[PDB]
Amino acid sequence: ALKDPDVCTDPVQLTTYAMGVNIYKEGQDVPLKPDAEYPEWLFEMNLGPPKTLEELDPESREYWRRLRKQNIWRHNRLSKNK
Amino acid sequence: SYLPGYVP
Amino acid sequence: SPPSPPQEEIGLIRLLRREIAAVFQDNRMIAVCQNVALSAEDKLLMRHQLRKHKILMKVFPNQVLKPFLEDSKYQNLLPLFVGHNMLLVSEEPKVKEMVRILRTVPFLPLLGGCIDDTILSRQGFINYSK
Amino acid sequence: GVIRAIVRAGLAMPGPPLGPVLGQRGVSINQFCKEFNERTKDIKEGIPLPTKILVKPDRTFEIKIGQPTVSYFLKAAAGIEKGARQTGKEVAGLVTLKHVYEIARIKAQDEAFALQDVPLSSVVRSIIGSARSLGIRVVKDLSSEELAAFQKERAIFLAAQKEADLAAQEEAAKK
Amino acid sequence: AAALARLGLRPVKQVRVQFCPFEKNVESTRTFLQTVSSEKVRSTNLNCSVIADVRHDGSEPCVDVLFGDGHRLIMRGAHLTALEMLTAFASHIRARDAAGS
Amino acid sequence: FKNKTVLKKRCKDCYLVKRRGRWYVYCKTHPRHKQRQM
Amino acid sequence: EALAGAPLDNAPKEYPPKIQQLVQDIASLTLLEISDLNELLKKTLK
Amino acid sequence: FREVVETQEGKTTIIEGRITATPKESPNPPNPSGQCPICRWNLKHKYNYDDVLLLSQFIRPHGGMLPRKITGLCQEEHRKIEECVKMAHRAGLLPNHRPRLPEGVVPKSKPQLNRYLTRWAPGSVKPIYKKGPRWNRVRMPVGSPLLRDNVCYSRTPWKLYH
Amino acid sequence: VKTLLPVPSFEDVSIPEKPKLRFIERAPLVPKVRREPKNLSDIRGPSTEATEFTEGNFAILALGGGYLHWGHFEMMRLTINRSMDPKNMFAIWRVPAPFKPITRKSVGHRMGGGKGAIDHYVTPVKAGRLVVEMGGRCEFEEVQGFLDQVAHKLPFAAKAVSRGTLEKMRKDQEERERNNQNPWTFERIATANMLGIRKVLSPYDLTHKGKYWGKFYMPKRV
RNA sequence: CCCAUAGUAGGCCUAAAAGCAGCCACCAAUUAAGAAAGCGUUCAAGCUCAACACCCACUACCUAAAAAAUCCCAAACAUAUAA
Ligand SMILES: [K+]
Ligand SMILES: [K+]
Ligand SMILES: [Mg+2]
Ligand SMILES: [Mg+2]
Ligand SMILES: [Mg+2]
Ligand SMILES: [Mg+2]
Ligand SMILES: [Mg+2]
Ligand SMILES: [Mg+2]
Ligand SMILES: [Mg+2]
Ligand SMILES: [Zn+2]
């Protein structure tokens, strides 16, 4: 009996408004602003698969953050049988 | 006063 | 035993050696508190109340920060770093805010640091605040 | 201690699963339902809201209601009702970076992100990760015509999936 | 932390840790503060106050503990290990607990 | 105590001790883990 | 190249030696010269 | 070395530690290249359980062994000295390194049996009721196998099983 | 700053379609009629077949001679298949199915009256033979545990090995022979009939060189 | 030894699946912590492990028993130059 409220299904509205951003009954839909009104870093975000260890720079925190996760993955693989 | 091969 | 070829410095150390330089060059207040074992919620909350006045909380390993200080001008800050050591670094001396936030926790010791290239004690800060 | 569960806005009920937990710990279920429904009166019903019920030693309860889950925000912005059954192979929804940016503004106010004083870029990077688990593809620009084409193809796929499920369910009946 | 917390701080009225951070003999005393100031140990008894005093007078570090019975324990950490101090602290906790009750 | 040719700790609270010339496994949390070298 | 350690809290007040020269230099100058210095100082500080 | 004194004055306990006189290693070791005290003085394979002058330097006041990290001994030599001290205690050669007894504890008299080269603890050993055939004889160990490499001045090697 | 190191990658590795060990039949599909002699030499001395790794990187190495009956194969199959990860691990048989017929006489009968009827089939194995070979996207530490469990339950001495550990084993034995300080070796004495020793030695000892006794392999013999 | 916050109860299926019945992905916040390696819960909670910090654990990475019938069964011995 419990579910989410009905979602929109209009391409025009779904591409011109952020439908679920406004959660209040008395509020209005949040209109999408023009491209010039959004920060530059938004459009440089990685929309694809995660960067691999080879792509990452060995002097960045991202490189060593990736190696630590891989070592944790290896530890879990080795521990499973142990 | 101990030589190279001195042993206590 | 023949010594072993010295292990080549890891790239993270270099990044840490560069971020320490930056924190130490581009900030003015550099307090040095002992990172006591407050709960995760409390540590996050006290770090949000300090960030209200944009007073950052750094944490650097004592095996990178010490070499740096040894070879740097801050050669008298070494004794402080015996144990867990967080840095409370702000870009403009906001001591009174830090001090009142730091006084909410009776057991968290403010050990000292260096404001405006002057190594102070705890009372130095409490005096610079007044 | 802390009781933490997702409770839909305005639809708190005395039934499971929160009710039994509250009763076992001594908190009155009816009182919470009234308080939660009253404090979530201005929010559209059915919105999943993560709740944090702080139970004090005398069994008086304080509730800490946060912003809706990111799963809702991404599903609502895509127009989809259910996520992908096999994310990475099937694209169940399509949203733009602008949608994610607008969601981050609301979700950045949640106490989890707000207390960390993280830049909005960090919240955007997190939302993109959650989208990659729901089957929703984030694209730099989406037109109304491109979204209609995808919706048309997605409807066909979903209809075929229903037929496949019916076949399995019908086969199970024959078993 | 865990070892001290298991015993608890029920008979300890106040714990005061006084050390000079710039001095070179405060490592043991500072380690003692970290253990007693842990959330677990502090949570055992909320009426006990852990007070950390930072001085730059150059005096040797000292730890003063006040129990509910009124007896006090003074531990001078200049030439004492953290483990030794914590062991003595725990023993006196046990002694003052049985006396009161 | 169960006699064992190979002594194995069955939980984190098991501790190995050599007493009266032979090895023992003692466990306060789960006394059933107690083992004697055979 | 190495800043001096912090003075003890109980030790008598100590002033850096580099300023000791500045303290003496001010006494030698004349009030008219100090006054002219001051007019430029007040404006420069604003 | 460092001592600790506990003094109760005016219903207050003061715990303090003082640094006492510390002995120094004799100068000019004959083998400076040595990596542990034993081989620095060319003592490897040349000491036994009865060399209390040597053994007593590596034990605590109550007869306990000292950590290997403190003494600097290697694992091999540290284990040899460890066994040698146990045999020295059992032989009665360390009468001033007895265990600490709490106040009010006077040990009850126990039969005096002179013994030496005792590998095991007397209480942990069972009688040899069945000796077994000559080709499978149950033997009584004497000494320690850790000392098997000690310098042998006789043509017969040390018998470790009697 | 705990120093992390690169994790090994198995991206090039490929898992066969049938990862698990196949079923081994008790007896050959066509039953053997001709009864065969005991031929105990088939488990004596060094193995010449299936001594090297083929597809996988891990295996169980035989350290003695023995016969594997169907009961052993079931223990190996069920233990390995239950313990292995089908997605990331694959296992192949490195031994043929039971093919050598073993005869038994009916209970209670005296000596004589001809040879007994065929009762069961066995697979002869020699020391040095790989018995099961495993591979896939895993490390030796992952499979060593359950492979060692299986090896312990075999009717001959056996040990789980890898490409690295197997090669190190062989290199160590070669080094021991090269640096051996004993001027007298079993090979030299036997091949020259020194002391007339060949009167107490088998012709096989000229090639076994004191490392094999019956079905038993002595790894510490040089 | 020490220590553990968080998008989030990822979606899917499911009466319920919340790291931990199954299927897919396995991205990301925080200096640091696996969309979870082992327990646990009807589902949750709850206890560990891999993280950070602290900091010289400065680990071995070879395994391991015993019982019979008249009564154990030489005595003994670790020390003087291989004969
Ligand atoms: K076996
Ligand atoms: K689940
Ligand atoms: Mg999570
Ligand atoms: Mg879910
Ligand atoms: Mg799940
Ligand atoms: Mg479960
Ligand atoms: Mg992370
Ligand atoms: Mg949990
Ligand atoms: Mg851990
Ligand atoms: Zn146990």
> Which string of DSSP letters, residue by residue, matches C77-119?
SGGG-SS-EEEEEESS--HHHHHHHHHTSTT--EEEEEETTEE
CA–CA distances in Å: residue C112 to residues A23, C46, E17, H161, I67 = 48, 19, 17, 68, 77
How far from C70 is each of A47, C110, E25, CA to CA, in Å? 44, 22, 19
In the 3-class helix/strand/coil scheme, how is I41-99 assigned residue by residue?
Answer: HHHCCECCCCCCCCCCCEEEEECECEEECHHHHHHHHHHHHHHCCCCCEEEEECCCCCC
Q: Whole-angstrom Cα distance, residue D65 to residue D68?
A: 9
Q: C1' nearest to CA of D116: which nucleotide?
A: J30
Q: What's the start-to-end Cα distance of chain F, in Å?
A: 11
Distance J70 C1' – D15 CA (angstroms): 84
Tokens of C70: 């040894």
State whether the beta carbon of A52 lies below 7 angstroms from any atom of strand J: no
Q: Which residues lie closer than 8 Å to I51 by C-beta, 6 or more apart?
A: I128, I129, I130
d(CA I59, CA I78): 16
Domain parsing of chain E, residue ranges: 12-95
Beta pairing partners, I122 = I100
Per-residue CB contacts under 7 A with strand J, chain F residues 6-25: 6, 12
Q: Which nucleotide is nearest to H130 (CA to C1')?
A: J72
Please give the structure tokens belonging to residue D13: 């009920």
> Tokens 């593809």 correspond to what residue?
D137
| Alpha helices per DSSP H over chain E | 2-7, 27-36, 39-44, 82-100
Q: What distances in angstroms separate CA A51 from CA A65, C47, C79, D5, D134, one per listed residue?
A: 12, 31, 42, 34, 20
Q: Name residue, tokens 């051996």.
A: I180
Give kind and range of the element (H or E) at residue C12: helix C11-25
Q: CA–CA separation, I69 vs I122, rounded Å?
A: 5
Pair H62, H69: CB distance under 8 Å? no
* I36 vs I28: CA distance, rounded Å: 15
Residues of C in contact with A60 (CB under 8 A): 15
Structure tokens at I8: 């090994």
Binary contact (D76, A45; C-beta < 8 A): no
**Nucleotide closest in space to D110 (CA vs C1'):** J7
Integer angstrom CA distances of residue I95 from C9, I75, I78, I123: 50, 14, 16, 8
Which nucleotide in the DNA or RNA is closest to residue D24, CA to C1'? J45
Is strand J within 7 Å of residue E83 (CB)? no
Q: Which of E18, E33, E43 to mutate to test the interface with C (most CBs of C within 10 A)?
A: E33
Are residues D126 and D113 both part of a single domain? Answer: yes
With CA atoms as reference, the chain H residue closest to F20 would be H124
First-to-final CA distance of chain H? 43
Closest CA to H16 of E16, I111, E74, C37: E74
Domain total for chain D? 2
Question: Which is it for the CA torsion G16, G22, G28, G33, positive or negative?
Answer: negative
- Cβ <8 Å between C45 and D117: no
Domain at D42, CATH number: 3.30.1550.10
Whether D43 sits inside 8 A of A24 (CB atoms) is yes
Which residues in chain G are contacts of E55 at CB distance < 8 A? 9
Distance from Cα D106 to the centre of ligand 7, integer Å: 23
D76 with D60, same domain?
Answer: no
Q: How far apart are CA D73 and CA D47, in angstroms?
A: 10
Q: Residues D111, D97: one domain? A: yes
Contact with chain D for residue A67, Cβ under 8 A: no
Burial class (CB in 10 A: 0-12, 13-18, 19+), I30: exposed
Look at chain H and report how many structural domains it folds into. 1
Domain extent, residue D40, equals 1-66
CB within 8 Å: A7 and D99: no
Give the residue among D96, D123, D152, D69 at the shortest CA–CA distance from A14. Answer: D96
Cβ contact G3–C112 (<8 Å): no
**What CATH code is carried by the domain that includes residue D119?**
1.10.10.250
Take residue I42 and report the two structure tokens written for it. Answer: 């088939």
Listed in order, strand segments (DSSP E) in H10-161 are 12-19
Task: Specify the resolution in Å.
Answer: 2.6
What domain range includes position H150?
Answer: 1-162
Q: How many CB atoms lie within 10 A of CB A73?
A: 11
Q: Is the CB of D132 under 7 A from strand J?
A: yes
Rounded to whole angstroms, the distance from the CA of residue C13 to the C1' of nucleotide J59 is 28
Whole-angstrom CA distances from I113 to H154, I33, I35, I37, I103 are: 67, 18, 15, 16, 14
State the CATH number of the domain containing residue C75: 3.30.70.1730
Those of residues 47-86 in C touching chain D at CB distance below 8 A are 48, 51
DSSP string, G1-46: --PPPPPPSSSPP---HHHHHHHHHHHHS-HHHHHHHHHHHHHHH-
Which nucleotide is closest to D118, CA to C1'? J29
As a whole number of angstroms, the distance between CA E72 and CA E66 comes to: 5
Collect all residues with Cβ–Cβ distance below 8 Å to F25 and sequence separation of at least 6: F4, F7, F8, F9, F10, F14, F15, F16, F33, F34, F35
Give the fold, CATH level 3, of E12-95: Glutaredoxin (3.40.30)
Six-digit token string for D68: 């809706």
Angstrom distance (rounded) from CA I180 to CA I170 = 15
Find the helix packing angle between D18-25 and D29-39, rounded to 10°.
Answer: 120
- What does the radius of gyration of chain B's CA atoms come to, in whole angstroms? 5
Q: Which helix (H) or strand (E) holds D101?
A: helix D97-107
Local structure of residue D151 (DSSP, 8 states): H
Chain C residue nearest residue A59, CA to CA: C11
Are C103 and C70 in contact by the 8 Å Cβ rule? The answer is no
Round the CA-based radius of gyration of chain H to a whole number and report it. 21
Determine the Cα–Cα distance for residues I134 and H9; give it in Å rounded to an integer.
Answer: 74
User: Do residues D56 and D90 both lie within one domain?
Assistant: no
**How many other CB atoms are found less than 10 A from the CB of residue C74?**
20
Three-state SS at E51: strand
In angstroms, what is the span from residue D4 Cα to ligand 2's centroid? 17
Taking the centre of ligand 4 as the mean of its atom positions, its distance from the CA of residue D95, in whole angstroms, is: 21
For ligand 10, a single-atom ion, the residues with CB < 5 A are F 10-11, 13-14, 27, 30, 33
D90 touches strand J (CB under 7 A): no
What is the token pair recorded at C7?
A: 């292990």
Q: Quick check: G5 and C76 in contact, CB under 8 A?
A: yes
Q: Find the helix or strand (DSSP H, E) in which A79 lies.
A: helix A61-81
Residue D14 domain flag = yes
CB of I127 closer than 8 Å to CB of I65: yes
Domain ranges of chain I: 18-222
- Locate D90 and state its tokens: 């099937």
Name residues 55-74 of chain A within 8 A of C (Cβ): 58-61, 63-64
- From CA C89, how far away is CA C50, in angstroms rounded? 10
I125 in Cβ contact with I43 (< 8 Å): yes
C-alpha distance from residue H162 to each of H83, H138, H140 (Å):
19, 9, 5
Protein-covered nucleotides of chain J (CB closer than 7 Å) are 2-13, 16, 18, 23-38, 42-46, 48-56, 58, 60, 64-65, 67, 72-74, 76-82
Q: Does G22 touch chain C (CB under 8 A)?
A: no
Which residues of chain A lie closer than 8 angstroms to I139, CB-CB?
Answer: 77-78
How many Å is the Cα radius of gyration of chain D? 20
Q: Does residue H13 sit at the E interface (CB-CB below 8 Å)?
A: yes
Residue C82: CA count within 13 A, CB half-sphere: 18
Domain membership of residue C72 as a residue range: 1-130
What is the whole-number distance in angstroms between the Cα of residue I153 and the centre of ligand 10?
A: 27
Could you check: is the Cβ of residue H154 within 7 Å of any atom of nucleic acid strand J?
A: yes
